[PDB]
């Protein structure tokens, strides 16, 4: 579980920022860069979750549902987010985004002991 921890750390990096509440375009531009999703190509869509890690991890403890890829280790919850969508023009590593802040249903996959988030499904 050096593995499960690496996967969890990747989830935190790509998807977790507790104390923003809901960013604008500049927030997406900064965070996509700082969380390492722009150096080699521009990731087209990404979500940052604005909840405490304890609360995100709690989603793992809910009833299992199917992931998009067919796995059965997914879980749904409702959280504050900023969704970041690439503008379509941009050229890595200078990637540009449009932000949408909202509270919405998310689906995450969890693994391990304790169960932790390892993938953001939708």
UniProtKB/Swiss-Prot annotation:
One cellular-component annotation, GO: extracellular space
Keyword annotations of the record: Antibiotic, Antimicrobial, Disulfide bond, Endonuclease, Hydrolase, Nuclease, Pyrrolidone carboxylic acid, Secreted, Signal
MF-aspect GO terms: endonuclease activity; nucleic acid binding; RNA nuclease activity
Modified sites of kind Pyrrolidone carboxylic acid: 4
Keyword Signal tagged: yes
EC identifiers of the protein: 3.1.27.-
A single GO BP: defense response to Gram-positive bacterium
Enzyme class: hydrolase
Cellular compartments annotated: Secreted
Disulfide pattern: 28-84, 42-95, 60-110, 67-74
Active-site residue list: 15, 119
Positions with a binding annotation for dUMP: 10, 15, 43, 46-47, 120
Chief site of localization: secreted
Family label: Belongs to the pancreatic ribonuclease family.
Record function comment: Cleaves preferentially after uridine bases. Has antimicrobial activity against uropathogenic E.coli (UPEC). Probably contributes to urinary tract sterility.
The protein's name in its UniProt record: Ribonuclease 4
Species assigned in the record: Sus scrofa
Entire-sequence positions represented here: 29 to 147 of 147
């Amino acid at each position: 579980a050096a593995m499960q921890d690496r996967m969890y750390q990747r989830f935190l990096r790509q998807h977790v920022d507790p104390d923003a509440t809901g960013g604008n375009d500049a927030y997406c531009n900064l965070m996509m860069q700082r969380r390492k999703m722009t150096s080699h190509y521009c990731k087209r869509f990404n979500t940052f979750i604005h909840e405490d890690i304890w609360n995100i991890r709690s989603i793992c403890s809910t009833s299992n549902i199917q992931c998009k890829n067919g796995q059965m280790n997914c879980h749904e919850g409702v959280v504050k987010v900023t969704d970041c969508r690439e503008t379509g023009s941009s050229r890595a590593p200078n990637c540009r985004y449009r932000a949408m802040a909202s509270t919405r249903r998310v689906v995450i996959a969890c693994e391990g002991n304790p169960e932790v988030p390892v993938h953001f499904d939708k």
